[PDB]
Amino acid sequence: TSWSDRLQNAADMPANMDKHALKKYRREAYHRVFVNRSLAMEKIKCFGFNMDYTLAVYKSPEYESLGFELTVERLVSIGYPQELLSFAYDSTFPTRGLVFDTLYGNLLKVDAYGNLLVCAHGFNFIRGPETREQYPNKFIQRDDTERFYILNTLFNLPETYLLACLVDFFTNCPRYTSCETGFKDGDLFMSYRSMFQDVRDAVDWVHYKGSLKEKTVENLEKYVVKDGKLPLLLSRMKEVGKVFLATNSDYKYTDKIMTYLFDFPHGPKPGSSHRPWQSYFDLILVDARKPLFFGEGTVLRQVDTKTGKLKIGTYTGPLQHGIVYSGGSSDTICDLLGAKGKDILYIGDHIFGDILKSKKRQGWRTFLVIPELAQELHVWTDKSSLFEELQSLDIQRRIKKVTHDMDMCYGMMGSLFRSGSRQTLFASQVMRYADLYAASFINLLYYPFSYLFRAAHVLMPHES
Amino acid sequence: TSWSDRLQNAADMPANMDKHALKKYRREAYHRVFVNRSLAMEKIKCFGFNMDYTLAVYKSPEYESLGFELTVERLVSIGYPQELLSFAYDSTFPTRGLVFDTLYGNLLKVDAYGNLLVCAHGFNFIRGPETREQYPNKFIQRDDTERFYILNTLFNLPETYLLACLVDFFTNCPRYTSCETGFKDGDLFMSYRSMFQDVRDAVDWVHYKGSLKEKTVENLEKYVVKDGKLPLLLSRMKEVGKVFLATNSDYKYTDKIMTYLFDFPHGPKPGSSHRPWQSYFDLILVDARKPLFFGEGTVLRQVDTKTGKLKIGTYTGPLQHGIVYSGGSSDTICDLLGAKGKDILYIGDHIFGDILKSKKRQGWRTFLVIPELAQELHVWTDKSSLFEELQSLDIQRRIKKVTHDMDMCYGMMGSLFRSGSRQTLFASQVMRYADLYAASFINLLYYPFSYLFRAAHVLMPHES
Ligand SMILES: Nc1ncnc2c1ncn2[C@H]1C[C@H](O)[C@@H](COP(=O)(O)OP(=O)(O)OP(=O)(O)O)O1
Ligand SMILES: Nc1ncnc2c1ncn2[C@H]1C[C@H](O)[C@@H](COP(=O)(O)OP(=O)(O)OP(=O)(O)O)O1
Ligand SMILES: Nc1nc2c(ncn2[C@H]2C[C@H](O)[C@@H](COP(=O)(O)O)O2)c(=O)[nH]1
Ligand SMILES: Nc1nc2c(ncn2[C@H]2C[C@H](O)[C@@H](COP(=O)(O)O)O2)c(=O)[nH]1
Ligand SMILES: [Mg+2]
Ligand SMILES: [Mg+2]
Numbered sequence: 001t002s003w004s005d006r007l008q009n010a011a012d013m014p015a016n017m018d019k020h021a022l023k024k025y026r027r028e029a030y031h032r033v034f035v036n037r038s039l040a041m042e043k044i045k046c047f048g049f050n051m052d053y054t055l056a057v058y059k060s061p062e063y064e065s066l067g068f069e070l071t072v073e074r075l076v077s078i079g080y081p082q083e084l085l086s087f088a089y090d091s092t093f094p095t096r097g098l099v100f101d102t103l104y105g106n107l108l109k110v111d112a113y114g115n116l117l118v119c120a121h122g123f124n125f126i127r128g129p130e131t132r133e134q135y136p137n138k139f140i141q142r143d144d145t146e147r148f149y150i151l152n153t154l155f156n157l158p159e160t161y162l163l164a165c166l167v168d169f170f171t172n173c174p175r176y177t178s179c180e181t182g183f184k185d186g187d188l189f190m191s192y193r194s195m196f197q198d199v200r201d202a203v204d205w206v207h208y209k210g211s212l213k214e215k216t217v218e219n220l221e222k223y224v225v226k227d228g229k230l231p232l233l234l235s236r237m238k239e240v241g242k243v244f245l246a247t248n249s250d251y252k253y254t255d256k257i258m259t260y261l262f263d264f265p266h267g268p269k270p271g272s273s274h275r276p277w278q279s280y281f282d283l284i285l286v287d288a289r290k291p292l293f294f295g296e297g298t299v300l301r302q303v304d305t306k307t308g309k310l311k312i313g314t315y316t317g318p319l320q321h322g323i324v325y326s327g328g329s330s331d332t333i334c335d336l337l338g339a340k341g342k343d344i345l346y347i348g349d350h351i352f353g354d355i356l357k358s359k360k361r362q363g364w365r366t367f368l369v370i371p372e373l374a375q376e377l378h379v380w381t382d383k384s385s386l387f388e389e390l391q392s393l394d395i396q397r398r399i400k401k402v403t404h405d406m407d408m409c410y411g412m413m414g415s416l417f418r419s420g421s422r423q424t425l426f427a428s429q430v431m432r433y434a435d436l437y438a439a440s441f442i443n444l445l446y447y448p449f450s451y452l453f454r455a456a457h458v459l460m461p462h463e464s
Numbered sequence: 465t466s467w468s469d470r471l472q473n474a475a476d477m478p479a480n481m482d483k484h485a486l487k488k489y490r491r492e493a494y495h496r497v498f499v500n501r502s503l504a505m506e507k508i509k510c511f512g513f514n515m516d517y518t519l520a521v522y523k524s525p526e527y528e529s530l531g532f533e534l535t536v537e538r539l540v541s542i543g544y545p546q547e548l549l550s551f552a553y554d555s556t557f558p559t560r561g562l563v564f565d566t567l568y569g570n571l572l573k574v575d576a577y578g579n580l581l582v583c584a585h586g587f588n589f590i591r592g593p594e595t596r597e598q599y600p601n602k603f604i605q606r607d608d609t610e611r612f613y614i615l616n617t618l619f620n621l622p623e624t625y626l627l628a629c630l631v632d633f634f635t636n637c638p639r640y641t642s643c644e645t646g647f648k649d650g651d652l653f654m655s656y657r658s659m660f661q662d663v664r665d666a667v668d669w670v671h672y673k674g675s676l677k678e679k680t681v682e683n684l685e686k687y688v689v690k691d692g693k694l695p696l697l698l699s700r701m702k703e704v705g706k707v708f709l710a711t712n713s714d715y716k717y718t719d720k721i722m723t724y725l726f727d728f729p730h731g732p733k734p735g736s737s738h739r740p741w742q743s744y745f746d747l748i749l750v751d752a753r754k755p756l757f758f759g760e761g762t763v764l765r766q767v768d769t770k771t772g773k774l775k776i777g778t779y780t781g782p783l784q785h786g787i788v789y790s791g792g793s794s795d796t797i798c799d800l801l802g803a804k805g806k807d808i809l810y811i812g813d814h815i816f817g818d819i820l821k822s823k824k825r826q827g828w829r830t831f832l833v834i835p836e837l838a839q840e841l842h843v844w845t846d847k848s849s850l851f852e853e854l855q856s857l858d859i860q861r862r863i864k865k866v867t868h869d870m871d872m873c874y875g876m877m878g879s880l881f882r883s884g885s886r887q888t889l890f891a892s893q894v895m896r897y898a899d900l901y902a903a904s905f906i907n908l909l910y911y912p913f914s915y916l917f918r919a920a921h922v923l924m925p926h927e928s
Binding site for chain 1: 493496498499500577578579600601602603605606607804805806823824825826827837840841844855858881885887891894895901918919921922924925926927
């Protein structure tokens, strides 16, 4: 049962808001908010939200699998072979945060220094001495952005698997010859770089001009987690501060999804009149273009919410009731809400585009949603004896074995957070940039108005 | 008594190499090697060294003070006012790692997120509410390299102080009007940006075309720490692996300094024949141009060691005995010594240019020398009751007060590593990029051939 089954199981539960019951619920790791740096919640004046995979968590593996099908169909329609149509999305293969190496066609799991934790070519896991042929220092240059692509988001799960499927398919299909950097089909050379670009192009097309949005919206219950407790949290937040939405999505899609997310026969709590999703927000901003949004951004536009089209021209007016913005920058939000960065708590799922960039560019407080944490915690817990076993030994053939059995419990590409005793890049970046994090933003409901999340002070080795 | 007095006090001590005496010596914090990430010393095949402030540690405050005088003299000679001649270097003012803000003329001490720990305008320490005028979020954008300059190295101590002196001088001199971004002298506007550039230009000139090198070399005992134990360490290292020198300096200067560093009436140990500094190294490389050296570098050249001039053309030959190289890249060292990055331990003092760049670009193992650690440890120790006091309270007017008295013990710009319970950027970068660090590279002498430096494994908050 997937991480989104855990999420929907907690979603079906009404909030018991008794102060005693709240403190007890957040005992459980799954309902907890984790703290990388202290944050006094009473200093927070604006709560900002992302929509996709934050407010609207798409069900797994159904959504990934829809994405994978439409990308495949798109590749087959631009000329890829019909055999692609036999692929079927497999949730047990990809882990998030993998690096595609476009030179050699390998998916890599790396730590924060670019050290190789896992290397797969197709579905062939390259170990020890064999990786040293292509990675003589067992290390990649992360600044080489033209060669290495980091697959950060849950939207990238379908392509993570599809890249391995393609490399597996071309390797084992006798119509093609394998070379170091790609495949020969007679007088045609298909490099892993141009293959990767085709997949990326196809994924982009499916979101932009394909039928992914259409398919999702015509079966929202199949694809999107809905939670009665969402309006309750938002309404509570609106009593102590301001609430905003900043999404990379367009207004028409945002309105279909948000509408559905609020579609209960009540408002914040049972018995109360239902109210439009828009009333829960002081500022709604679509077509954000994060991370560019946290730099110069783009021109501020105003949505005509009646036609779903943009009005012509740059919006020069004040924040008015019922106005929906498009584009702009993070300075728009600050100026319009009278916030400085440390007043803002921004709640997002995109480690780079939401969390890293708002923290480093603007000094916003950050809350990272990690949907898979629901499952990762259940595995971390019922395999703690294995990690604790791995911990003891470090004072060797045994270390390699335990490490592998540990990781396998998570899937073929192992845990999101570590490979044995080595932390991944993703884990590193969570700790550095996410002040808070949790399986779901909803976990904030279980903490009182002005709670002080504490992390311990950090000492250097000479200071200890 | 300065950090370089501590260093020269340990330098005057002969090595007692009895295995028992070595383990006892490295008990003491000052003779210890500190560990950020585990490193098995038996896996290290090449030890690489930087020269300036690594092998050749310049005496404090005499060297900074020579640097400050010649920079001042240079500014006065290009047209700055004669009053500059009354400045006198003051070691109690600058701390290393400060950020000059060229827009407002402030020296800032920041954490890794760009949060302001300390702000000084001239010698006026701007506190609390007053900094919020110019830094409304009490935060700087570190990616704004055109505005913010990080003063990383001990070479930058003179200009750190000189920048504050100039801002103090122009503020209080009635011939000038102070504006937000600089000084008005009638029809002349001198911005803090162009003033900063003049200082930087002057410092560059003093190293490149001025008399700093000449002055240093004609009084080496006054300016440079010499240690009988240096040839002993190098010779021990040469028995288990290869040794290299990579310096940004030119050959003529490197030869004067290195010669002096080896000038003892013995070789590695008393009684042994003295041998030239060059025999201690498998590869000598000058005019390195770090950090560009850790990317594409420059053309590999060969020094004519007889004339101290470069031979004309690119060196295409093998590593031969007695050859001295100039320029090249870090790949030169690897190819010529048959190393991969994790085989190399590079020992440097430049957090960015030596340590951060070799780690992230090449995956070298790193050892950061921090000369001031000698003093910082003595203050950390005999003021541990103050920090421990500061630690307790965190469950407020008191916190501000303790923090200030704590920092004052270090100097006006406080500790290199923290301001109260907040770590600086420099501390952050040491922990992230320096696998090992110590007050001096010599501390390695106190650890056996194949020692395993251990750091504890890191857990995420959900993993604990
Ligand atoms: N998770 C990510 N997804 C996409 N791009 C990223 C991610 N993290 C960093 N980048 C960008 C930032 C840099 O422009 C580029 C080069 O990597 P690098 O210089 O190693 O980044 P970095 O500065 O964040 O490293 P570090 O984690 O040590 O601070 O990749
Ligand atoms: N100590 C330093 N001295 C000089 N330049 C530096 C130093 N540290 C980082 N830089 C450079 C690297 C970047 O090009 C530039 C912009 O800063 P920023 O993007 O915040 O760097 P960073 O990626 O190292 O941040 P972080 O420490 O969070 O990883 O400054
Ligand atoms: N074009 C394109 N759109 C993407 C890609 N990945 C996700 N999206 C779209 C899906 C959503 O409409 C939007 C999500 O952004 P946000 O999480 O800010 O609400 O981004 C991609 O790889 N290419
Ligand atoms: N031009 C110039 N040279 C500098 C500056 N700071 C230090 N140097 C020179 C002094 C030494 O000759 C050389 C030191 O580099 P290394 O520590 O790699 O051996 O750099 C500077 O700011 N400008
Ligand atoms: Mg999102
Ligand atoms: Mg140096």
